[PDB]
Amino acid sequence: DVAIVKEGWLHKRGEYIKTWRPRYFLLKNDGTFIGYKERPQDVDQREAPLNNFSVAQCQLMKTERPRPNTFIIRCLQWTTVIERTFHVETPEEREEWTTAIQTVADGLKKQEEEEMDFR
């Protein structure tokens, strides 16, 4: 029952080269957040994504420097800290994305609690 919640272009900052590159991202309701260099094609041939990570259990932060309307997805995975940084042109667009991501994460957190509580 996995479905795309929101998709669109985002300016993503590199993990190694801290430069910014346009990436087409798709957020699914199972937590999947996948980004491509180009908008995906309809075939088993379609190139692999450049970014692929679950937003489950992650935290959303907003910042204005160095670029305004920046949002960061931070996940504490074991001993490794994952941080993915994105920028959009307007604060409205950022709210659009952060709300969508937070809703998906919250849904997954709800499922987690229902599995782990009072077992």
Swiss-Prot record:
Q: Where in the cell is it found?
A: Cytoplasm; Nucleus; Cell membrane; Mitochondrion intermembrane space
What does the record say mutating residue 15 to K does? Loss of membrane localization
Which residues participate in 1D-myo-inositol 1,3,4,5-tetrakisphosphate binding?
A: 12-17, 21-23, 51, 84
Which residues get modified to N6-acetyllysine?
12, 18
Member of which family?
A: Belongs to the protein kinase superfamily. AGC Ser/Thr protein kinase family. RAC subfamily.
Q: Which disease is it linked to?
A: Breast cancer: A common malignancy originating from breast epithelial tissue. Breast neoplasms can be distinguished by their histologic pattern. Invasive ductal carcinoma is by far the most common type. Breast cancer is etiologically and genetically heterogeneous. Important genetic factors have been indicated by familial occurrence and bilateral involvement. Mutations at more than one locus can be involved in different families or even in the same case.
Functional note? AKT1 is one of 3 closely related serine/threonine-protein kinases (AKT1, AKT2 and AKT3) called the AKT kinase, and which regulate many processes including metabolism, proliferation, cell survival, growth and angiogenesis. This is mediated through serine and/or threonine phosphorylation of a range of downstream substrates. Over 100 substrate candidates have been reported so far, but for most of them, no isoform specificity has been reported.
- Identification of the protein by name: RAC-alpha serine/threonine-protein kinase
Tell me the organism.
Answer: Homo sapiens (Human)
Q: Which residues of the full protein are shown?
A: 3 to 121 of 480
